[PDB]
Design a protein around this motif. Sequence first.
Motif, PDB file in Angstrom:
ATOM      1  N   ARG A  81       0.945  -1.267   0.154  1.00 45.48           N
ATOM      2  CA  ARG A  81      -0.119  -0.329  -0.482  1.00 45.48           C
ATOM      3  C   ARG A  81       0.630   1.191   0.225  1.00 45.48           C
ATOM      4  O   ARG A  81       1.849   1.668   1.131  1.00 45.48           O
ATOM      5  N   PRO A  82       0.275   1.861  -1.129  1.00 46.04           N
ATOM      6  CA  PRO A  82       1.724   3.777  -0.930  1.00 46.04           C
ATOM      7  C   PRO A  82       1.638   3.830   0.717  1.00 46.04           C
ATOM      8  O   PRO A  82       0.163   3.950   0.895  1.00 46.04           O
ATOM      9  N   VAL A  83       2.245   4.728   1.071  1.00 45.06           N
ATOM     10  CA  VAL A  83       1.986   5.971   2.595  1.00 45.06           C
ATOM     11  C   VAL A  83       1.467   7.094   2.660  1.00 45.06           C
ATOM     12  O   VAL A  83       2.207   7.003   1.269  1.00 45.06           O
ATOM     13  N   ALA A  84       1.180   7.401   2.682  1.00 44.27           N
ATOM     14  CA  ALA A  84       0.000   8.831   2.671  1.00 44.27           C
ATOM     15  C   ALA A  84       1.322   9.764   2.337  1.00 44.27           C
ATOM     16  O   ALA A  84       2.287  10.000   3.373  1.00 44.27           O
ATOM     17  N   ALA A  85       0.688  10.526   1.645  1.00 46.80           N
ATOM     18  CA  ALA A  85       2.237  12.097   1.242  1.00 46.80           C
ATOM     19  C   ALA A  85       2.128  12.635   2.288  1.00 46.80           C
ATOM     20  O   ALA A  85       1.429  13.118   3.367  1.00 46.80           O
TER      21      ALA A  85
END
Lengths: 268, 244
Positions: free
Chosen positions: B8-12
């Motif tokens: 999952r991408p990490v939050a920007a």
Amino acid sequence: DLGTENLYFQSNALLSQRSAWFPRPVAAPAEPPDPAAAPLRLVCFPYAGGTVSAFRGWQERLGDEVAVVPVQLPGRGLRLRERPYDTMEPLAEAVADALEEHRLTHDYALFGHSMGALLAYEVACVLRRRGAPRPRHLFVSGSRAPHLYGDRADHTLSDTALREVIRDLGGLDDADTLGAAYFDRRLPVLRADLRACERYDWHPRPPLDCPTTAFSAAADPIATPEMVEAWRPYTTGSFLRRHLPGNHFFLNGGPSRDRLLAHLGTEL
Amino acid sequence: QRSAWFPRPVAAPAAEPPDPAAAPLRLVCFPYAGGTVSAFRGWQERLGDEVAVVPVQLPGRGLRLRERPYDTMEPLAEAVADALEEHRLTHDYALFGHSMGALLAYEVACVLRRRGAPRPRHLFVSGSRAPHLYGDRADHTLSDTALREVIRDLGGLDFDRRLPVLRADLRACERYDWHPRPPLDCPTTAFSAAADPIATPEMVEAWRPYTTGSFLRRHLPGNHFFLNGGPSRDRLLAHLGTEL
């Protein structure tokens, strides 16, 4: 006459302040959406030596109707203890296996940059031969058409020589502050990834059926309008080329990144 | 194995807003009738650091609730134009408006031209018939209840303090007395919505001759208030981003 009949409106000093007409913009409440349940899944592939990190912040820019699903190739991130693939075909087959296993082969599109474009293409071909659903869309950036690969031999060069090509292409602007030692960490993965593109030799096959949008960059020697225009016959669907101002590593951030994301958002 | 292949991408880190003073482009944004700057919440993060989003608060609403709302488009556009010049927003700028706000944006571009100011980099018009097609409606003369139900039926409510402002905004549109003028020269993009009875594709396509630069119309899903949320809002922001 000091009566109330004699009174007159005076300029409203409050209205001279910038914030009266122009309040500062306000951030919205910060999901992300579940890949399993999203209307669309955008499966994203990195450039050679790159990781899923390239796609940080894509989710927030694209919004809640698409799940950004970056692919982490062996040899990096949590997969640092796994030998990197160095040949395109087994890599594309392993990605296809992973996509099928984790049920990502419905309501999906593909994106790839540079080496990741070729990988995305090869993955679309493997999925077709397996009779899986086709992508909704194929997006390729920083990449010449598949048949145009084979020219290059960067993965054979010396550490210093390879590093200087990456610097030359705009992939090492960090070095100014972080020092170049930082980069050498990536060399083995970069070499493996590069071998997959450079020893690639496009064997003729039928074109895909999905819409395809390709991106050229003004300052990319390897993404000129005509190398990228060359993707046109690789699909029997609609093809569009969009042109961007940046270099080979624009993905890293700037106007070109923002515009790529915008273009992506228009077609999802 | 899903964590290996498909992390999952990490939050920007939601970025610090760009300084409107220094941004390479300032996008000046006008709301629909009876609307406020809240229409453009989230626009800044979605559009990124190369554009400063500048929503415009018109007299009669928010903290300006004690000012009489303009009910005619030309003096409103002139007061906006005074404010833009005073605050050095009259270069490296583009204009956006939705519905009534699209008409205002067009009028502001015309006032700025008459005043010898630099032209807009771009005009974006959304959910609006072309200027010469205004002036047939009389929603501003309806009862409080009938007007509310018109807005509810168009998809605007899902008020009574803000009725005098809504009415004045609608008056500016519906009393609009179109006069033929030379076309603008700036690039112009128009947006129509598939479920918008007010501003149909043909009414929106009619903006084409109002510029001598490039004109594009994009046709979106959604109703008259399609900018307020969902798929259509996302697509608008994306089309906007492709030209800024």
